Design a protein around this ligand. Structure first.
Ligand SMILES: Nc1ncnc2c1ncn2[C@@H]1O[C@H](COP(=O)(O)OP(=O)(O)O)[C@@H](O)[C@H]1O
Ligand SMILES: Nc1ncnc2c1ncn2[C@@H]1O[C@H](COP(=O)(O)OP(=O)(O)O)[C@@H](O)[C@H]1O
Lengths: 159, 176, 261, 444, 68
């Protein structure tokens, strides 16, 4: 689990962090409940960080995942489906619906914020090619957000 | 390689039935080769003369070659066992190549029992390397099937010391 | 590689047991043609097939002929030649021959004699104990030699399937075995006809009478029969071959094999 | 397999028909047991023909005395006793296959599944698999088409298809299972099986109703989700079959479908190659689709679909045969989906042709040309640019677009110098031409 | 672990049996055995693949019970 934690913070690759997290959860198979919950949470967080939420449904449908199912697990599944929909708003909705369940600063809040920035950058870059000059409130309308936050994100990208 | 043997068929004898049989099987496919060609039967090549020493296999083979008036190539079988890797294989390859390049020849390989073992493997030895020389000779027997030239004559004393692999219709067949 | 894809109309030069030839082709060709489907669905293609009939119908002739639909290069490898020394490191030689088959990817390895003289003398149980079987197990574990990628099969032309290490007939082993024995009367007359095909003389088509005297004679023997008939015509310097010449040839070979057996 | 030890051909010949008479209606099981003992004796003696005859006689007795249940446990015991002789059991299954197909009955489905369970213990490619294939096909016919048996025939075919196929029987079996798969309306698995089987071609040069049937079942599979280029490719692959079997109605309707589809496909270099290859066909001229293709393929015309629905839209209402046209656009739900697919397709086509002609076009004119409003036109414009098909830059506050890449001054002066050198070469060629014509003209 | 759990290896594969061989099997052979999970009939690796990997290229050396 710690090796996966370190690799997840290194952020160069997340598949090896997925392997370490799964091994830790496999070690925690109905032995230590809180450590098992943390291991599966980290495993699914790096799985969605791999930008492949398609295998999330199979992973959460696994026997051990159902055995250790919980509100935090369902919140992570909703985060995965938000990544499926590529909706930064849906990800923000899931984070607010389960905030205290995913408010943990260590590799939970940090990675969710990093992923949220990734969707923001991807949405902006995906909608920005056609426009040689576009009004920013139109950009906010397409992204379905306010004006100040969209302007702040677009700035921080361009600085 | 003797360029031309001069020994005559008259100075040998005793086994006249056998010598006439192999004359029909070898010399006639040389002189009257067109007879076999128009008949449609390709003559056999492999003739194995098995019998104790002093029975005249060498004289008969050379006399047959003289009657054919074609090239005669003699192989010293017992000394084909060379320590060099594939040496016997190379010797047999170029021997067949020389015979093919020089007329319908007579390949007179002596000591076929020495060349091929009966696969009586033992802890002392098991004919490991010489099997390479043996399979080369087997693969070279089929080279001259078209146009049916260069006959193979193998001389030994005991035919039974050979495995049932050299004995075949296209391979060594005329055991005399 | 010594023998290659170029071959005669052997498919028609075999004659006897054409159904058996079709069955062996049906077993062999499809994984040989498109092995990618086996990987695509996750099934292991067969490795080869077994052949009986120690002196009978040409097993090597079948190995040649069947490759007509295969466009592959049949290789005639001897079991003694491939094991060489009596050590487990005999796998070096199979690696070389398999690499040769990998270089000429469409290749079938035709084995010469694995159950050395299955009719008599020393079998797998006698003489060399388990040395043949372990060396065959080496080719067995070769089955992961990229069967999807490699167009290589191995035909085992044993003499008698009696002593073949029945541990080598399980699934994943050689598996398939096709029954070949001495040709029946129908196969015998067919192969007599194809042997007489190149022979154009007066004679007659009285093949059944020849079959009656020459029953239970192997295809190689019947090829020898036709050659002996030509030898009889030419020893007598006659440009004609009549059924009497065939009768003399059949009687000669029958007496020869009767004395030798 | 193993050498025969003690034959009992005389014993079975002298006793088996007498046993059949003694149990003509099968009320006696001691007769079954004593033939079991006899075939066990011949089995320990390693005889195959005697055992096969005994098994064939036993099932024949069960046929004539119509004890269906006792047949079920009897064949179960026979197949499970010690596995007996593989030749004999393969035989017995074969006559069981021959018998189950003649009596309709209710529990023949139970007979089919019983033999399936007896043969599914393994030994599929070895010792008869066509029986199991025929039983599964028989189960398909008994259940009259459903999802469970269609899945069963899906998961059965692969072993025998890879091992021992038939150039007609096996492919027909594949065709008879994919149609059930499409009836189930599974798309991922039906696509997988179709793409894993279609690799086996070069038999269709002698097809009668096989390649066309394969293709006409995989038309729906492809066009169901998003396919439009493979659609035209295999519709021309069914078009070339009436070339060798000239039947006018199917030939002409195939021409109508392929011409419509090939234009309807999204723009790409390959689609351009297909449309240019299709155009110029001598046999294509006598249909209105000839005029449709000639108009809508090239020369960058304004494809106002509002005008096209009456100028070349007559195929919807009435044409020569209008049967493929009614299939495509005359349908209600899928027809309106394909109508919308024509609607957008011509919108990107108009955008693309405008790209190579107009540098800056006002927003109102472009929207009017695209038959949509400003927001819809800019949305499709964004859809093109995210696909990198067009080099477009738009000022959204001003509503003005540009299609020309900003010319770097390096290559700008380079093409200027190339223009200079072209002029210089023209001066040289003109000078030589006029001077020499001057020489010819003053030869007086 | 390099190939992430042998590219999602199954649970019932543990190396406890095929590692306690006392048959040399140098790290190069260990890497080769790891890559002999190339049996792509399935998306997962089983203990059979490891057994075949150990079976190929091996020499029989055993009999520690006399010494212990
Ligand atoms: N039929 C024969 N007529 C004349 N000399 C013979 C005859 N048979 C053998 N010889 C003598 O035997 C010698 C050949 O011996 P060799 O070739 O070794 O016998 P084999 O061929 O039986 O091994 C010759 O020098 C020759 O003088
Ligand atoms: N059915 C057959 N038709 C034609 N020739 C045959 C037949 N069977 C055997 N032969 C001949 O026998 C020779 C070798 O046969 P071989 O493969 O040694 O048979 P086996 O292995 O059963 O002894 C070939 O040259 C071939 O011409």
């Amino acid at each position: 689990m710690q090796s996966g934690i370190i690799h997840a913070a290194e952020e160069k690759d997340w598949k090896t962090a997925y392997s370490y997290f799964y091994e830790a959860f496999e070690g925690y198979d109905s032995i230590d409940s809180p450590k098992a919950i943390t291991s599966l949470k980290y495993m699914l967080l790096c799985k969605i960080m791999l930008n492949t939420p398609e295998d999330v449904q199979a992973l959460v449908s696994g026997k051990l995942a159902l055995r250790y199912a919980g509100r935090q697990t369902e919140a992570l599944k909703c985060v995965a489906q938000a990544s499926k929909n590529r909706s930064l708003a849906d990800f923000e909705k899931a984070l607010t619906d389960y905030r205290a369940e995913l408010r943990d600063d260590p590799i939970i809040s940090t990675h969710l914020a990093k992923l949220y920035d990734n969707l923001l950058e991807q949405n902006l870059i995906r909608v920005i090619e056609p426009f040689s000059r576009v009004q920013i409130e139109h950009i906010s309308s397409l992204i379905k957000l306010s004006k100040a936050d969209v302007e702040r994100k677009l700035s921080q990208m361009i600085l | 390689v003797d360029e031309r043997p001069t020994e005559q068929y008259s100075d040998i004898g005793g086994l006249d039935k056998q010598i006439q049989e192999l004359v029909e099987a070898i010399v006639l496919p040389m002189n009257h080769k067109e007879k076999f060609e128009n008949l449609g039967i390709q003559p056999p090549k492999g003739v194995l003369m098995y019998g104790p020493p002093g029975t005249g296999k060498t004289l008969l083979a050379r006399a047959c070659a003289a009657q054919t008036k074609a090239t005669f190539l003699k192989l010293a079988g017992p000394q084909l066992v060379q320590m060099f890797i594939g040496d016997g294989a190379k010797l047999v390859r170029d021997a067949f190549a020389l015979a093919k390049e020089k007329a319908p020849s007579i390949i007179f390989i002596d000591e076929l029992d020495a060349i091929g073992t009966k696969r009586f493997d033992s802890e002392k030895a098991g004919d490991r390397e010489v099997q390479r020389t043996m399979l080369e000779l087997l693969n070279q027997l089929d080279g001259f099937q078209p146009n049916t030239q260069v006959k193979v004559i193998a001389a030994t004393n005991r035919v039974d010391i050979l495995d049932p692999a050299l004995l075949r219709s296209g391979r060594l067949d005329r055991k005399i | 590689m010594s023998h290659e894809d170029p071959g005669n109309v052997s498919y028609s030069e075999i004659g006897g047991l054409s159904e058996q030839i079709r069955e062996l082709r049906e077993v062999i060709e499809l994984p040989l043609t498109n092995p990618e489907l086996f990987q695509r669905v996750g099934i292991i293609p067969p490795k080869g097939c077994l052949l009986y009939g120690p002196p009978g119908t040409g097993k090597t002739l079948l190995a040649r002929a069947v490759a007509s639909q295969l466009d592959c290069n049949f290789l005639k490898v001897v079991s003694s030649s491939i094991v060489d020394k009596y050590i487990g490191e005999s796998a070096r030689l199979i690696r070389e021959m398999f690499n040769y088959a990998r270089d000429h990817q469409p290749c079938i390895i035709f084995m010469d004699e694995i159950d050395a003289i299955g009719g008599r003398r020393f079998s797998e149980a006698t003489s060399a104990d388990r040395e043949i079987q372990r060396t065959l197990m080496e080719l067995l574990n070769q089955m992961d030699g990229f069967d999807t990628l490699h167009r290589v099969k191995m035909i085992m032309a044993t003499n008698r399937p009696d002593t073949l290490d029945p541990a080598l007939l399980r699934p994943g082993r050689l598996d398939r075995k096709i029954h070949i024995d001495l040709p029946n009367e129908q196969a015998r007359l067919d192969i007599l006809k194809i042997h007489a095909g190149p022979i154009t003389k007066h004679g007659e088509i009285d093949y059944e009478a020849i079959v009656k005297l020459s029953d239970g004679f192997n295809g190689a023997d019947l090829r020898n029969v036709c050659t002996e008939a030509g030898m009889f015509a030419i020893r007598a310097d006659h440009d004609f071959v009549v059924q009497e010449d065939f009768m003399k040839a059949v009687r000669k070979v029958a007496d020869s094999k009767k004395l030798e057996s | 397999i193993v050498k025969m030890e003690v034959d009992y051909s005389a014993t079975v010949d002298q006793r088996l028909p007498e046993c059949a008479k003694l149990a003509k209606e099968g009320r006696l099981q001691e007769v079954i047991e004593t033939l079991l003992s006899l075939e066990k004796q011949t089995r320990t003696a390693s005889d195959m023909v005697s055992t096969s005859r005994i098994l064939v006689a036993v099932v024949k007795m069960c046929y004539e005395a119509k004890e269906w249940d006792l047949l079920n446990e009897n064949i179960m015991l026979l197949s499970k006793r010690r596995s007996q002789l593989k030749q004999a059991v393969a035989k017995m299954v074969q006559q069981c296959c021959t018998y189950v197909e003649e009596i309709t009955d209710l529990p023949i489905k139970l007979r089919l599944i019983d033999t399936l369970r007896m043969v599914t213990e393994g030994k599929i490619y070895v010792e008869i698999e066509r029986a199991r294939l025929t039983k599964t096909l028989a189960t398909i016919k008994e259940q009259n088409g459903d999802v469970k048996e269609a899945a069963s025939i899906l998961q059965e075919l692969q072993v025998e298809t890879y091992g021992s196929m038939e150039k007609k029987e096996r492919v027909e079996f594949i065709l008879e299972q994919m149609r059930l798969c499409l009836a189930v309306k599974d798309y991922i698995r039906t696509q997988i099986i179709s793409k894993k089987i279609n690799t086996k071609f070069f038999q269709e040069e002698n097809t009668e109703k096989l390649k066309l049937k394969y293709y006409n079942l995989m038309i729906q599979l492809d066009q169901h989700e998003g396919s439009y280029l493979s659609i035209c490719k295999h519709y021309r692959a069914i078009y070339d079959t009436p070339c060798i079997q000239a039947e006018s109605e199917k030939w002409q309707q195939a021409l109508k479908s392929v011409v419509l589809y090939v234009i309807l496909a999204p723009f790409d270099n390959e689609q351009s190659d297909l449309v240019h290859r299709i155009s110029g066909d001598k046999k294509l001229e006598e249909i209105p689709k000839y005029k449709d293709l000639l108009k809508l393929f090239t020369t960058m015309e304004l494809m106002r679909w509002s005008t096209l629905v009456e100028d070349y839209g007559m195929e919807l209402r009435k044409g020569s045969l209008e049967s493929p046209a009614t299939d495509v656009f005359g349908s209600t739900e899928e027809g309106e989906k394909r109508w919308k697919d024509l609607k957008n397709r011509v919108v990107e086509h108009n955008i693309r042709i405008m790209a190579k002609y107009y540098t800056r076009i006002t927003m109102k004119r472009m929207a009017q040309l695209l038959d949509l409003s400003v927001d819809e036109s800019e949305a499709f414009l964004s859809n093109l640019v995210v696909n990198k098909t067009i080099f477009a830059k738009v000022d959204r506050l001003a509503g003005i677009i540009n299609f020309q890449r900003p010319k770097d001054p390096n290559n700008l002066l380079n093409d200027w110098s190339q223009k200079l050198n072209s002029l210089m070469s023209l001066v040289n060629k003109t000078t030589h031409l006029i001077a020499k014509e001057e020489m010819i003209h003053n030869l007086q | 672990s390099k190939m992430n759990l042998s590219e999602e290896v199954d649970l019932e594969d543990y190396v406890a049996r095929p590692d306690k061989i006392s048959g040399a099997d140098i790290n190069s052979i260990c890497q080769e055995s790891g890559m002999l999970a190339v049996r792509e009939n399935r998306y997962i690796v089983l203990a059979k693949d490891f057994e075949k990997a150990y079976k190929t290229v091996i020499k029989k050396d055993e009999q520690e019970h006399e010494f212990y």
